[PDB]
Design a protein around this ligand. Structure first.
Ligand code: MG
Ligand code: MG
Lengths: 117, 49, 117
RNA sequence: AAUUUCUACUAAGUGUAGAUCGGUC
RNA sequence: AAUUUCUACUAAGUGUAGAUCGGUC
């Protein structure tokens, strides 16, 4: 019960991380659903733990299309973030908003969502 | 009227795992910028398909 | 490094717990602020990590006064919950919703907040 | 829950409806 | 984002605005 509890501790670190991401997803969901679909930021999407205070701008998976339609998951009720229009079916559950359009974006844009409105 | 009335039964495609809803008593945003309102709120469930 | 890191890991477990309490405080904050002051649940109030899945009704600090005036606490952006009227000034930020008057009440009533109305 | 101070508010969007003379246990 | 099916909505509260003859590549 030495290394097993060690990887359990790693799973608990990932639990605190994914609950920080889920908490910021909830408050960020509130400030995004406060916006009338025009002052929305261009948001990086992912289906992986994306940890906005530890964002890595390395891979070409970074994308900057305007988010919308952040509705539930009605077996577990979630904020869900279609990255395009209604009819693109690109639902995700991990988002980080950034500055503007594509190509070597700026870095983080943390907690400036009230300055978008 | 005319002949050839055809009753078509249709099966189910979306299973019960991937249903996504608009919940009750939650002010959601609105798509059209020409909307004079900005939010809307209902008292029941609005599903997806 | 033998005994200190042990309580560091325990502090991380308490961090995951208090972020669960903060998340349920956030969702519960939204579902309570979507209610018109008359169908409000009778709310146990505390300024301590209150953890409704690990609730113990042994102390005499149980109380079920109807909640009201839930608003924002922007110095650390915390959701603040008054427990009396406007003019009782007993602000708290840890809440558990149950049913009814005082004395050996119903126990927890978690995840039934949509059934309030 | 914003006030010349107090109270009931959010009340058409940095406010609305009232009332208040004296310094003194 | 709820439909007889399709599309843009929430549009006064399990809907609203239009359009659709045909089984066949
Ligand atoms: Mg007052
Ligand atoms: Mg549609």
């Amino acid at each position: 019960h030495n290394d097993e509890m060690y990887l359990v501790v790693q799973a608990l670190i990932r639990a605190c991380i994914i609950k920080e991401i889920d908490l910021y997803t909830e408050q960020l969901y509130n400030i995004i659903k406060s916006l009338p679909y025009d002052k929305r930021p261009n948001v990086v999407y992912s289906d992986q733990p994306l940890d906005p205070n530890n964002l890595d701008l390395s891979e070409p998976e970074l994308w900057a299309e305007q988010v919308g339609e952040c509705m539930r998951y009605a077996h577990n009720d979630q904020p869900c973030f279609y990255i395009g229009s209604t009819k693109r079916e690109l639902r995700v559950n991990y988002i980080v908003p950034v500055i503007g359009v594509r190509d070597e974006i700026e870095r983080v844009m943390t907690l400036e969502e009230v300055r978008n409105l | 009227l005319s002949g050839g009335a055809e009753l078509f039964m249709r099966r189910a495609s979306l299973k019960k795992e991937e249903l996504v809803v608009h919940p009750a008593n939650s002010p959601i945003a609105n798509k059209n910028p020409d909307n004079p309102k900005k939010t809307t709120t209902l008292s029941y469930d609005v599903y997806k398909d």
